[PDB]
Amino acid sequence: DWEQYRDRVNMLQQERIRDSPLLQAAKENDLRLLKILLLNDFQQRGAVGETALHVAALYDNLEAATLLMEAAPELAKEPALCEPFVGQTALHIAVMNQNLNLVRALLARGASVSARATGAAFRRSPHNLIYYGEHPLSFAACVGSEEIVRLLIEHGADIRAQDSLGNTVLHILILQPNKTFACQMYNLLLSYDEQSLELVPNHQGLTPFKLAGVEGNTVMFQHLMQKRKHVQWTCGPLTSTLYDLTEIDSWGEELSFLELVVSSKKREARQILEQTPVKELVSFKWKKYGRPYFCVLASLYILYMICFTTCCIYRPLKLRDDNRTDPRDITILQQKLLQEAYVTHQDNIRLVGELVTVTGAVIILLLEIPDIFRVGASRYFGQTILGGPFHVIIITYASLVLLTMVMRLTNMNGEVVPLSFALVLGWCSVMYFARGFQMLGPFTIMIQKMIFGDLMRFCWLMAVVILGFASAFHITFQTEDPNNLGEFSDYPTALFSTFELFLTIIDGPANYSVDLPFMYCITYAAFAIIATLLMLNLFIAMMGDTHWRVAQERDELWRAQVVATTVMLERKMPRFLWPRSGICGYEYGLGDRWFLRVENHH
């Protein structure tokens, strides 16, 4: 694994540094020994191809570093050579240690301002504790060393240079955790912008502005917006400001800023939706257009589920064509064949409801399947904010409807099976629309967070209790007459009875007209204590405990689900239903831009 490899790399590196007297002296700064070694081979390299000057820079030894450079000035030009540290110069190290005196002394000797630390130890990854990109300028920037940043830009640091992710120094500052200084650095770098560096995309296509949204960097987002706003007037406690929406609303771009924020996997990204140009924009879009269209679509879907349900209630059945010879058989009706299922006026009235039913299942797949391939199947089905679990069950619903159509046409028996799944999944998919309503929306997120959290843990331990007790109850009744207590009469019935007895959805077996096994009363007392009293009530206790701790995040997830719904509706619906949002600049002489005006009290 990578941790064991990095560890060896570090161990071999320290071993070489102890083995070589020149690298050893570069780490210890014993200028006596180092002068004698240099007066007496300067190319000597550690375990990763690093020079004695990289070693002096790593241990921050300016005296050893200047002796090494005075003896062999060419060392200032050298990269490290091996897979972890490829391209790392003594200048990258001196910059990361903030040694301005060593950085000057290296630049005075031709150390490259444009060198790229291409090795893995520099790549963005979960493996690496930092990500400064690849260049001395990007290091000095993320390190928060203006004096080094100016010194490098003077010496030719290309400010528009890009690393292996395509990230410029501006993209890299958006990724750093000192969000507050990163701003002062962001302004220092834009003081040399003179296409703007603000508009350069990385290889994901993200500009710095889109990256601050995607990464949830709310401090850099609100800092970037201070240069995309104009104060129209202030009068007493009131100010009117005009925000340029060109970045946030992303008109006619192939993937918008708000899509990138709502689909981001960072929990910090949802906080961007609470910021001033945005909250007001997504709130305007939702009241004016989003909620009216979502209430119409919710109503049409519920009427379509009533239509589908009615085609199940009036499903085509006839009297069985053979006798119930087994006294335990209760089936009295059978399917009509296709050639007899459409004969009466009521069958033709149903056929309209069935063709509407099938048409809705086709339309569901025509609307769903393309969005799997844009968003990505895992995000499509995994993301709570995008509706992931409802996209699974609506595709499953439409698939079970189309399977039921193929079964009808082919005279295949057993349409009850796909229709029973399609009725449960079809109606529970009406919970998709709960996200538009402040009453139902946050509660539907508790249902989801309780299903995947507490109900899953409960069902795993509930299963071993049911297997223990269903087996004990089955073998207790194995020897007794099945007609006197039917609940445990075979292992599948004993499992199902024990599951219903666990949840108290059926009454505990009892027949006072006969002597039940004494081992049953012992086993059922232990079961009612463990299953019913302790665990079924411990479920309520752990749900009540989960609920107060999740209640803040559920509201944030709901406020984000409303924005994701707003963004979905505007991307999918015909534009004539969704007029461009905000204020057109052109009819007021402001040029091609579109704006949001907000008035605030202070």
Ligand X SMILES: CCCCC/C=C/C/C=C/CCCCCCCC(=O)O[C@H](COC(=O)CCCCCCCCCCCCCCC)COP(=O)([O-])OCC[N+](C)(C)C
Ligand Y SMILES: CC(C)[C@@H](C)/C=C/[C@@H](C)[C@H]1CC[C@H]2C3=CC=C4C[C@@H](O)CC[C@]4(C)[C@H]3CC[C@]12C
Give the one entry of ligand ECN, a copy of itself, ligand Y, none that residue 295 binds, where binding means its C-beta sits below a cut-off of 5 to 8 angstroms depending on kind: ligand ECN
Q: Is 302 in the site for ligand ECN (CB under 6 A)?
A: yes
What Cα–Cα distance (Å) separates residue 191 from each residue in 174, 187, 202, 217, 218? 17, 6, 21, 21, 22
Q: Minimum CB separation from ligand ECN for residue 498, in Å?
A: 16
Q: Minimum CB separation from ligand Y for residue 390, in Å?
A: 6
In sequence order, which residues have a C-beta less than 8 Å from that of residue 29 and are 6 or more positions away?
56, 59, 61, 63, 64
Q: How is residue 481 written in tokens?
A: 């007459």
Among 11, 238, 296, 302, binds ligand X (CB under 6 A): 302
Check: CB of residue 38 under 8 Å from CB of residue 71.
Answer: yes
Check: CB of residue 89 under 8 Å from CB of residue 79.
Answer: yes
DSSP letter, residue 42: T
**Alpha-carbon gap, residue 200 to 185, rounded angstroms:** 18
Q: In what order do the strands lie in the sheet with 594-601?
A: 229-235, 238-244, 594-601, 583-584
Q: Is 296 in the site for ligand X (CB under 6 A)?
A: no
Q: Is 421 in the site for ligand Y (CB under 6 A)?
A: yes
Q: Is 299 in the site for ligand ECN (CB under 6 A)?
A: yes
Q: Is 373 in the site for a copy of itself (CB under 8 A)?
A: no
Q: Is 523 in the site for ligand Y (CB under 6 A)?
A: yes
Q: Minimum CB separation from ligand ECN for residue 433, in Å?
A: 4
3 state DSSP class of 334 = strand
Using the minimum distance from each CB to a copy of itself, give the nearer residue, 213 or 387. 387
Q: Is 303 in the site for a copy of itself (CB under 8 A)?
A: no
**Alpha-carbon gap, residue 483 to 480, rounded angstroms:** 9
Q: Is 459 in the site for ligand X (CB under 6 A)?
A: yes
Q: Is 452 in the site for ligand X (CB under 6 A)?
A: no
In sequence order, which residues have a C-beta less than 8 Å from that of residue 156 and are 6 or more positions away?
113, 114
Using the contact rule CB under 6 A, the part of the chain among 169-177, 310-318, 371-379, 491-499 near ligand Y is 491-499
Instruction: State CA 253 to chain mean position distance.
Output: 22
Using the minimum distance from each CB to ligand X, give the nearer residue, 21 or 492. 492
Going by C-alpha positions, the residue among 34, 52, 35 that lies closest to residue 43 is 52
The number of beta carbons lying within 10 Å of the beta carbon of residue 326 is 8
Check: CB of residue 335 under 8 Å from CB of residue 317.
Answer: yes
Using the minimum distance from each CB to a copy of itself, give the nearer residue, 99 or 207. 99
| Residue window 462-481: x/- pattern of binding to ligand Y, with contact defined by CB under 6 A | xx--x-----x---------
* Interactions with ligand Y, residue window 359-398 (CB under 6 A): 389, 393
Q: Is 542 in the site for ligand ECN (CB under 6 A)?
A: no
Using the contact rule CB under 6 A, the part of the chain among 109-117, 297-305, 349-357, 415-423 near ligand ECN is 297-305
What Cα–Cα distance (Å) separates residue 492 from each residue in 24, 487, 517, 598? 74, 10, 20, 65
Using the minimum distance from each CB to ligand Y, give the nearer residue, 39 or 464. 464
Q: Minimum CB separation from ligand X for residue 481, in Å?
A: 15
Check: CB of residue 181 under 8 Å from CB of residue 187.
Answer: no
Q: What is the dihedral of CA 345, 348, 353, 354, to 10 degrees?
A: 140
Among 11, 306, 510, 526, binds ligand Y (CB under 6 A): 526
Q: Is 239 in the site for ligand X (CB under 6 A)?
A: no
Q: Is 456 in the site for ligand Y (CB under 6 A)?
A: no
| Residue window 314-353: x/- pattern of binding to ligand X, with contact defined by CB under 6 A | x---------------------------------------
Q: Is 508 in the site for ligand Y (CB under 6 A)?
A: no
Using the minimum distance from each CB to ligand X, give the nearer residue, 129 or 330. 330
321 known member of a binding site: no
Using the contact rule CB under 6 A, the part of the chain among 84-92, 98-106, 267-275, 293-301 near ligand ECN is 293-301
Considering only CA atoms, give the Rg of the chain.
35
Using the minimum distance from each CB to a copy of itself, give the nearer residue, 377 or 467. 467
* Interactions with a copy of itself, residue window 547-586 (CB under 8 A): 547-548, 551, 583
Beta strands in 169-251 (DSSP E): 229-235, 238-244
Check: CB of residue 350 under 8 Å from CB of residue 311.
Answer: yes
**Alpha-carbon gap, residue 450 to 546, rounded angstroms:** 8
Using the minimum distance from each CB to ligand Y, give the nearer residue, 67 or 472. 472
Q: Is 417 in the site for ligand Y (CB under 6 A)?
A: no
Q: Is 491 in the site for ligand X (CB under 6 A)?
A: yes
Exposure b/e, 522-558, CB count within 10 A at least 16 = b: ebbeebbeebeeebbeebeebeeeeeeebeeebebbb
Q: Is 506 in the site for ligand Y (CB under 6 A)?
A: no
Applying CB under 6 A, what is the total number of residues that bind ligand Y?
A: 29
Give the one entry of ligand Y, ligand X, ligand ECN, none that residue 417 binds, where binding means its C-beta sits below a cut-off of 5 to 8 angstroms depending on kind: none
Check: CB of residue 336 under 8 Å from CB of residue 316.
Answer: yes
Q: After which residues is the chain broken (C to N over 2.5 A)?
A: 40, 194
Point out the annotated binding site for Ca(2+).
507
Contact residues for ligand ECN, defined by CB under 6 A? 295, 298-299, 302, 430-431, 433-434, 437, 439-440, 460-461, 464
Contact residues for ligand X, defined by CB under 6 A? 302, 306, 309-310, 313-314, 430, 456, 459-460, 463-464, 467, 490-492
Point out the annotated binding site.
507
